[PDB]
Amino acid sequence: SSLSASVGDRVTITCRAGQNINNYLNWYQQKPGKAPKVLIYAASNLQSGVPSRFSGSGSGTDFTLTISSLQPEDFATYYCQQSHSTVRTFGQGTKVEIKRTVAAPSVFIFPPSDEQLKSGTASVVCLLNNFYPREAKVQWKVDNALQSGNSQESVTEQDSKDSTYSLSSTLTLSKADYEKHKVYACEVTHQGLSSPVTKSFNR
Amino acid sequence: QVQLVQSGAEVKKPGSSVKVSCKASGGSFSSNAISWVRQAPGQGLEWMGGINPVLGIGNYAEKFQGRVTITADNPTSTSYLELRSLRSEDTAVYYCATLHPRLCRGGTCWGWFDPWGQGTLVTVSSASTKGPSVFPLAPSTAALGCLVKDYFPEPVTVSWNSGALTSGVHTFPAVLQSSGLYSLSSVVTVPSSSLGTQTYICNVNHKPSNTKVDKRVEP
């Protein structure tokens, strides 16, 4: 579902099938926030207007879709569509991400606002800023107690100008449960981190 | 066929009924040629239904052979999609698309889809409208932000300094709490000399509740 490549690489996406769907697999392209558009139909038929890098092949069971040289506006998600009397499926989807060199996450921690504690809920924000690759894991510690179920990661799409991600894990407690603990540590490990960074605070 | 145009966003409640239109405007069209594919947030596609050429009435997926009913108004050239017994798993973006038939070896035709509608979002939760809560996030290359923590439904805008600040601003995709409300956080990285020397204010507008709140951040 995910492939990382840079402009000028050639990528080819295979899409196998269970039975024999002959020539009835289509390819669609979807960009974040918009409906799908068809690129190839009938296994190999480029739709009018789509550039000539795109090249569909295969018949019977194994089907491919190639881009001979990637361009900036090529970085989107590609679903193959089976549509037969045997199977009538779409794809998991395959996302082509724009490749860059590893970046170390700039970390930040945010204890609850004074105004928020007046509400009975106490939410702790951690922040990972401008990193590549996306693969990074945060780990919440409260007084050396490891947390797993109150946090909620959410990460952005690759930045238009940095080609980097930013992740924001938010730990939310009740005002009461918040007052029982001293250390609020947010440990993050990344590809571009020589040793895992921890950004703690004592209440 | 040229300009599939869909109705608009609908918030609904579990157990309820939505009816979504697909206009199919412009040149020569066949409203009986529209199908309906559905996309559930964060993941892939599943076709829901089409219309039988030999009968003029709908044909739906096995997973919806229950309470789905697509109807084709040949004169006004629109396709209405009615999904009832709405559940929470039915929250998705619902597309219409014109089917180009290639093989029909049942009573149903299927092949490939060319124009796709712009898509309407059907958010269905047991929750009800609520305005957001803004909580500042103070600084110590220094970051600051705002926490928008409990609102419903999805659409919410975040600005900084009433529109000036657009550099290092982020605003993350919202997450949905087990409670049912949405919370997102927006941060910005700024220099450590403009702390106090420049005041940072974020603007949050939640139109579903006509809630326009601004909360400034100080160290």
CATH 2.40.30.10 fits B10-124, yes or no: no
Cα B185 to Cα A65, A123, A156, A187, B212, distances in angstroms: 39, 11, 11, 19, 16
Chain B residues inside the 8 Å CB shell of A27: none
CB nearest to A26's CB, from B112, B149, B187 = B112
Q: Which of B117, B149, B172 sits opposite A35 (nearest CB)?
A: B117
Tell me which residue in B119, B147, B187 faces A123 most closely, judged by beta carbons: B147
Asked if domains B10-124 and B134-217 share a fold, the reply is yes
Domains A2-98 and A106-202 share a fold: yes
Q: With CA atoms as reference, report the closest residue to A19 among A71, A82, A70, A68.
A: A82
CATH code, A2-98: 2.60.40.10
Whether omega before A133 lies within 30 degrees of 0, making that bond cis, reads: yes
Residue extents of the structural domains in chain A: 2-98, 106-202
B9 and B119 Cβ atoms separated by less than 8 Å? no
Q: Which residues pair with A103 in a beta bridge?
A: A132
List the domain boundaries for chain B. Answer: 10-124, 134-217
What is the experimental resolution, given in Å to one decimal place?
Answer: 3.3
Of residues A34, A38, A76, A80, the one with CA closest to residue A58: A80
Q: Which CATH number fits domain A106-202: 1.20.1430.10, 2.60.40.10, 3.40.50.2300, 3.40.50.620?
A: 2.60.40.10
CB B93 within 8 A of CB B127: no
Q: Give the amino acid at B22.
A: C
Would you state the structure tokens that stand for residue B21, as one six-digit string?
A: 């239109």
Q: Tell me how far apart the alpha carbons of residues A6 and B191 are, in angstroms, rounded to a whole number.
A: 32
A108 contact B CB<8A: yes
Question: B45, A36: Cβ pair inside 8 Å?
Answer: yes
The distance of A34 to chain B (nearest Cα, Å) reads 7
Instruction: Report the candidate in B127, B105, B96, B106 with the shortest Cα–Cα distance to residue B25.
Output: B96
Decide yes or no: CATH 2.60.120.560 for domain B134-217. no
Which method resolved this structure? X-ray
